[PDB]
Amino acid sequence: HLLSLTRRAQKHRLRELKIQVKEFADKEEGGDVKAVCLTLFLLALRARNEHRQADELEAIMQGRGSGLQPAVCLAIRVNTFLSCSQYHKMYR
DNA sequence: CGGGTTTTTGTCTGGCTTCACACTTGATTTGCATCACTGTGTAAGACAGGCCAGATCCAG
């Protein structure tokens, strides 16, 4: 079952398709394999109605800091009736 | 009871990455320990004793 083996074998299996994608990228974008594969996988996720994972992927492709400032954490801790102990529990 | 037919993979091989890898040291940020209290335990039932009430016996 593919997507479960290790490397150097799944390659040997998908070598034909990989060289075809390489030819297509060379013909279209001259070798921009990374971007075209990213777009193909994003649309493949969107086809199966998996917007959450696709959004997470397109957000991490930037690699960004999704950290909340302490004001927002304080607002959440106050306006939701949370004791400091339970908030610390959730935090850890 | 073991001859063929496909996966499943470290390998050779040297030349290239993005990553990895040694003292400071003063603040700076986490992470953990410490201390005085806490809330849930939350209505009835069995029994002895005193008390009159009306019944229990006694008298000429």
Curated annotation (Swiss-Prot):
Coiled coil: none annotated. Changing residue 12 to A: Allows robust hairpin activity. It is found in: Nucleus. Changing residue 13 to A: Impairs DNA-binding and reduces hairpin formation without affecting nicking activity. Residues 1-62 bind DNA. Maturing lymphoid cells and central nervous system. Signal peptide: none annotated. Disruption phenotype: Mice display a severe combined immunodeficiency phenotype. The have a small lymphoid organs that do not contain mature B and T-lymphocytes. The arrest of B- and T-cell differentiation occurs at an early stage and correlates with the inability to perform V(D)J recombination. The frequency of homologous immunoglobulin pairing is much lower. No obvious neuroanatomical or behavioral abnormalities have been observed. Autoubiquitinated in the presence of CDC34/UBCH3. Catalytic component of the RAG complex, a multiprotein complex that mediates the DNA cleavage phase during V(D)J recombination. V(D)J recombination assembles a diverse repertoire of immunoglobulin and T-cell receptor genes in developing B and T-lymphocytes through rearrangement of different V (variable), in some cases D (diversity), and J (joining) gene segments. In the RAG complex, RAG1 mediates the DNA-binding to the conserved recombination signal sequences (RSS) and catalyzes the DNA cleavage activities by introducing a double-strand break between the RSS and the adjacent coding segment. Homodimer. Component of the RAG complex composed of core components RAG1 and RAG2, and associated component HMGB1 or HMGB2. Interacts with DCAF1, leading to recruitment of the CUL4A-RBX1-DDB1-DCAF1/VPRBP complex to ubiquitinate proteins and limit error-prone repair during V(D)J recombination. The RING-type zinc finger mediates the E3 ubiquitin-protein ligase activity. Belongs to the RAG1 family. This is V(D)J recombination-activating protein 1. The gene is Rag1.
